[PDB]
Amino acid sequence: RPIEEKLEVIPVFLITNYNSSPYIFQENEKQVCYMFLCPYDAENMLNDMIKYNGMKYNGNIKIHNITMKKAYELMKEFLQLEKMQNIYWKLISSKRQLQNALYYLSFTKKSELMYPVFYAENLYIQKDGSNIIPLFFDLEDLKEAIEEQKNKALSKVDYKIKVLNMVDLIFTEDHKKFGFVPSTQSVKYLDKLNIGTK
User: Fold this and answer.
1) CA 134/CA 187 separation, integer angstroms
2) Which CATH number goes with the domain that contains 63?
3) SS (H, E, C) 64-94
4) Residue 133: other Cβ atoms inside 10 A
């Protein structure tokens, strides 16, 4: 499976009108749209829009879901048209996970903290058909997978939790050894968007 397919299972959230078109904001001096890896960060921005401009936004905004695949196609397609006005698609990591990740970075190592994903040293999962290392967007999902492993271990094992930059993983000379595990909350949230439609 290509990486474009590995990113497909990762939900991304935008705030849109009812036609599902994103709201553009002027970030001196480009046209910027916001894409959230965490749906509650998106809900927060929607809430701020209602709060500070209810006249313009009430009854006219919703959360819309795409995937990291589509999001990658967007960020990438941007750099191209840039050579040959254009919207800058800004990806926003989970606010809560960025905080969680700081713990695992040293003072000067946390400077470049970008798009955190978490993994454990001695933890694996079986993909098709070999075994790979699980890469979690949510720390709490990782810790949950560790406890499942320890509760059934035959030996005492250390699970050194480490943080990686999701971006660097896209371009590894060999990422076949990794599997992405989306935030279980992000995925669960997709049920709300589609169960809460007309």
Assistant:
1) 16
2) 3.40.1350.100
3) EEEEHHHHHHHHHHHHHHHHCCCEEEEEECC
4) 15
Amino acid residing at 183: S
Q: Return phi, psi of residue 156, to 5°.
A: -90, 120
Nearest-angstrom CA–CA distance, 10 and 70:
10
Residue at 138: amino acid letter: D
Q: Do residues 72 and 156 both lie within one domain?
A: no
Where in the sequence is the domain holding 170, given as residue range(s)? 93-181
Q: What share of the chain is helix, strand, coil (3-state, %, to 5)?
A: 40, 25, 35
Separation of alpha carbons 159 and 23, rounded Å: 42
Q: Looking at the structure, tell me whether residues 59 and 133 fall in a common domain.
A: no
**Can you tell me which residue has the tokens 């946390």?**
110
Q: What are phi and psi of 52, to 5 degrees?
A: -95, -10
Task: Provide the 3-class DSSP secondary structure of residue 122.
Answer: coil
What resolution in angstroms, rounded to 1 decimal? 2.2
Residues 37 and 73 in one domain: yes
- The token duo for 30 is 């480009």
Q: Are residues 14 and 66 in the same domain?
A: yes
